[model samples]
Target: GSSGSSGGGTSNEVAQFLSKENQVIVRMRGLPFTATAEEVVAFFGQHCPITGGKEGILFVTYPDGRPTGDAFVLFACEEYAQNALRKHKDLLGKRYIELFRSTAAEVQQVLNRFSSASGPSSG
Candidate 1:
């Protein structure tokens, strides 16, 4: 469960509103079994224009020792998100990637599901 409220006047309101903007989640699917987190970061580094672009974290392996075979890359800002999708939507890697703007709650739900399915003591 998540709840929050923003309040301000004029300029503050605009800033607060924009601050609530959606974050982009770029998920690359059908990745080769050989794909590694380092490789994915390097790929994003080569494609993304932001300085220290690939510095973002990567979750390469699930708790059950199964490779995710998919990667999620996050952008610092919505503009970067837009630019990344626009510039590299079709750029191929080990597999095709998908992009979407998602709330933090949505991202957390997916992660929670994965964790629950692959709990530490399960496997």
Candidate 2:
């Protein structure tokens, strides 16, 4: 039995994110537009605490307010984040989802930008 980290190609992006202090966020792509936050949590199998409940699973949208079919998830810790990565290229519904290590700040940027443009809600 052989165990190695580099047996397969290692992406610089993963290493780069791993080096950061607070890079427990992951970006999941190829989700169906109808994908729900609960489905994402289930896909993750409750490995880690999502920072802000459903808010931690952020579905991306274009400036025009259309779904972009991607989302960001902020895991409770790097360990959970890595566990989540193991599901990369795994099926989310009928579509294959891709996972990329990301940073909290990056996720926040996307959240803030979209929220600002879309506004919170109607009175």
Candidate 3:
């Protein structure tokens, strides 16, 4: 959530974790496969657009190598994630979306796995 200011290194990563007392990674499931990033920003209601970076809805597809259905929303802080969670069980094109507070470690692992799978330039 913090998008830590330190450069890419242990210190930077540590800062994200430490400053994360007020931060959280929000995850959602049961979304329609075609949900767009813009739609997700709207779903959050108050969260800003992801114009600066594609850090809005990072979709996690089926392990069979397809795409869409679920995603992670990197909120700037804990309240953002909590507010997002308040909208849990919402409908994303008829599908009842489920939200939850996710740990930074789990978030990191998922990103790493995805990035590695997609190759150097894709992630």
Candidate 4:
């Protein structure tokens, strides 16, 4: 039998990327299928600070016509987005939503795709 006390390694993962970013859009997933943009705001409002209220949250859906249970949330800045991350895994009913670092461009692309996908028609 042999036993040894191995040296422990220190984990120093710096969040410099967050600190320097001027903007931060949070990608949220695992939302309840019935969840709305307003509910998303309230959920984040419970802990993470956000701006634009309901307007700040964008619900993503499938082009075929269905809720994807995902959304993109815009923040005033990186600090707020950073704070929002703290709410990750927070319960949104029977399910918990996950948050990830996202970009404005990514949000825009989703918006554009959805926008053109549903064009106004005269019947």
Candidate 5:
């Protein structure tokens, strides 16, 4: 899903909310070129409570050859997402991973882009 900008003081509100809950799901940008799906999953699994649980699944991917500087992680719920944010905010960049509620269209756009890039399915 494409990340949206938090207007005005909403960003601060998000930060506060995350701090209170100790979990956060974010759209990460500026990932290192060496990042891989397994690595990202491992990172979150190690740091975030959601990924540490049975229901937790970390989804990480990037534009082909563009480097994994940006990606998204989904938790079981908003609360789990917040918990992730609270612990590993600094892992993505310095202070925090960009947080926003993803829109349906935005998510479809990203999915479409990846699908097209991956070409037709064999099955």
Candidate 6:
């Protein structure tokens, strides 16, 4: 019953377009289990409205219902998105954060795999 589409065949597709219009989804690894959305915002030194870079953020949770040590941030504009990557410049501490540029579609692929892996025993 996943009705209610904002157009573009599937809602996911529509969302993808909208997200692409203004977002800089960065793939972050090595995130502390206790990390918060704000922590990331501060850590990166920026926040958006539509997702996170300017202020708005589309919260994401792991399929396992726990921290996946990853996050997606949306910038005010695509320019900010690309700049976020540069300003942040991947990695954090001595261990490094293992950050990388990512797309909404790629995020979906990761979610698909993660969910299936954590889902009830295969059919």
Clashing pairs in 1: none
Which regions in candidate 6 have their CA more than 4 angstroms from the true location? 1-20, 46-61, 87-95, 118-123
lDDT of 2 by residue, 4-57 (tens): 332532223323333445537788788988888888867775666665546566
Backbone clash count, each prediction separately: 0, 0, 0, 0, 13, 13
RMSD of 5: 12.7
Q: State every prediction's TM-score relative to the real structure.
A: 0.55, 0.64, 0.60, 0.65, 0.44, 0.59
CA deviation > 4 Å runs, candidate 4 = 1-22, 108-123
User: Model 2 TM-score?
Assistant: 0.64
Kindly provide the TM-score of model 3 when superposed on the true structure, using C-alpha atoms. Answer: 0.60
What's the CA error at residue 80 for candidate 1, in Å?
A: 1.7
lDDT of 1: 0.50
Error of 3 at 77 (Å): 1.1
TM-score of 1: 0.55
Residues 1-123, candidate 4: write the lDDT tens digits. Answer: 533222221111112222324657888888898888778778867666556667556677765678867777767777777887887797877788798978855655554455435453322
Question: Candidate 3: where are CA atoms >4 Å away?
Answer: 1-22, 47-53, 62-65, 111-123
- State in Å the error of residue 70, model 1: 3.3
Native-to-model Cα distance after best TM-score fit, residue 49 in candidate 4, in Å = 3.0
Report the lDDT of model 3 for residue 9: 26
Among residues 3 or more apart in sequence or in different chains, the pairs in candidate 2 whose N, CA or C atoms overlap within 3 Å are: none
Model 3 lDDT tens row, 13-107? 33444344444667667777677676687777555322212443466653356764556666666656776777779876777889898775676
Best candidate according to TM-score: 4
Report the lDDT of model 5 for residue 117: 54
**Is 4 or 5 the stronger prediction by TM-score?**
4
What tens-digit string does per-residue lDDT give for candidate 1 at 36-108? Answer: 6566566556646333334443343454677665455565666666666664444445356555454444544
Q: CA shift at 5, candidate 1, in angstroms?
A: 29
